[PDB]
């Protein structure tokens, strides 16, 4: 499918030579894709086709995918929204969720996950990531659905990573690979 899409574009000569051999050598191979590559939606447990017309959203629940800024794997995170009349400071002071994610499946459009004081009290601070944007932006809240697979987030740019990748990238670069904040730099 990618070699047929390339034939709709103005290919340069270096890539053209490799694409002629590449087109034969793929058309030769089997007519299926490896199941281990197919991305899972963690909200609805649906396997998503490797390219789709809707883009970086689940084909079933239309949940936006959240990606590791090291590797672009989908991150076992679901974004959620506070119920009306809860402040960001109250939400942190408070910090059932899976039982919302099982109920909302099969709709025609994206529905945001809305979270009450009772559900916030049932969370743990180890599982929750919070993007503390400067004003005028509101803070964004995310729940990890696999606590045993650790996620780290940059305090400057709020990009998300597997923790092992983030520590290795910060050791390689001496700083966050996306926004160049050093590990020793006190935040704003």
């Amino acid at each position: 499918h990618a070699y047929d899409k390339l034939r709709g574009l103005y290919i340069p000569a270096r890539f053209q030579k490799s694409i002629e051999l590449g087109t034969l050598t793929i058309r030769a191979k089997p007519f299926h894709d490896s199941e281990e590559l197919v991305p899972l939606c963690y909200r609805c447990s649906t396997n998503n086709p490797l390219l789709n017309n809707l883009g970086n959203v689940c084909i079933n629940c239309r949940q936006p995918f959240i990606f590791s800024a090291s590797s672009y794997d989908v991150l076992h995170l679901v974004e959620f929204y506070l119920e009306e009349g809860i402040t960001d400071e109250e939400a942190i002071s408070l910090i059932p969720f899976t039982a919302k994610l099982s109920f909302e499946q099969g709709g025609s459009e994206f529905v945001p996950v809305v979270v009450s004081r009772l559900v916030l009290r049932s969370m743990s601070r180890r599982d929750v990531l919070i993007k503390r944007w400067p004003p005028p932006l509101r803070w964004q809240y995310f729940r990890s659905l696999l606590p045993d697979a650790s996620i780290t987030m940059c305090p400057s740019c709020f990009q998300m990573f597997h923790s092992e990748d983030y520590e290795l990238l910060v050791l390689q670069h001496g700083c966050c690979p996306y926004c160049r904040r050093c590990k020793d730099d006190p935040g704003p």
């Binding site: 290919i11 000569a13 002629e20 051999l21 087109t23 034969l24 050598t25 058309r27 030769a28 191979k29």
Partner: protein, 271 residues
């Protein structure tokens, strides 16, 4: 009878007997393809008995035992290719041991000639009409002015000229260019003709130099008339260089065409 082309010596491997008179045979990779009773046998040239599946040592085509007879075949780095009396052209991929393309022509396919990879084919039909077939988009392009006297076809092995091929008979070679990528869409064009000395048989085309076998057993090289510009331009100035320029423009070799226009120093040649 099969032989290994080692660096220090040539060794006879084996002799093999087929079910009828062999019309033709082709070799590539570890494999040979032989045509006899209107059926093709594909087989290994070398067999090691341990750790291989028996169905990969040899296979017979057409493998479903259809009523169609194979009239011609070819073998590349990746593909067995063949043409039938029912006008079918089929590609079989050797590494995963499976069919991968099928085309039907309105009449039988009499001969076939792939490029060095297999991505273009020339085929000759029952009316002796020549066609370029592109399995990669399943399209066919009729070869213009194709003589019914044509005995065979050779593709150019030079990197700038991948779309160039030649068709030949006992007296002449015809030079053809398949233009794949152009704003008008893909087409075959006759670039010219070269007279061949009596009973010379073409074997290899490289950079417009055609190597032929003679009746004496020796080889001889013929530069194509479509390639006369490859001679040393500076001593005739514009006269060999103007046909070089035209051909280098058409082959997209614009770094060569620049040095040619630098020699001419004409505002028209730059335009």
């Amino acid at each position: 009878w099969f032989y290994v082309l080692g660096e220090n010596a040539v060794k006879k491997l084996k002799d093999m007997e087929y079910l009828g008179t062999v019309a033709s045979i082709c070799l590539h990779s570890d494999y040979a393809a032989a045509l006899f009773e209107g059926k093709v046998q594909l087989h290994l040239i070398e067999s090691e008995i341990l750790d291989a599946q028996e169905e990969r040592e040899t296979r017979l085509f057409p493998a479903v035992d259809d009523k169609c007879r194979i009239l011609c075949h070819a073998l590349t780095s990746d593909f067995l290719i063949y043409g039938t009396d029912t006008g079918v052209v089929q590609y079989f991929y050797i590494e995963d041991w499976q069919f991968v393309n099928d085309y039907r022509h309105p009449v039988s396919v009499k001969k076939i000639f792939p490029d060095p990879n297999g991505t273009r084919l020339v085929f000759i039909d029952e009316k002796s009409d020549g066609f370029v077939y592109c399995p990669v988009n399943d399209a066919t392009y009729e070869i213009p002015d194709f003589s019914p006297t044509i005995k065979g076809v050779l593709w150019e092995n030079w990197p700038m000229d991948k779309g160039v091929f030649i068709a030949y008979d006992d007296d002449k070679v015809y030079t053809y260019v398949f233009h794949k990528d152009t704003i008008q869409g893909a087409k075959v064009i006759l670039a010219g003709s070269t007279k061949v000395p009596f009973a010379h048989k073409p074997l290899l085309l490289y950079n417009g130099e055609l190597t032929c076998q003679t009746q004496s057993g020796k080889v001889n090289n013929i530069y194509l008339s479509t390639h006369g510009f490859l001679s040393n331009l500076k001593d005739t100035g514009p006269d060999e260089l103007r046909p070089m320029l035209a051909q280098n423009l058409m082959l997209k070799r614009f770094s060569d065409a620049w040095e040619m226009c630098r020699i001419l120093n004409d505002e028209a040649a730059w335009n």
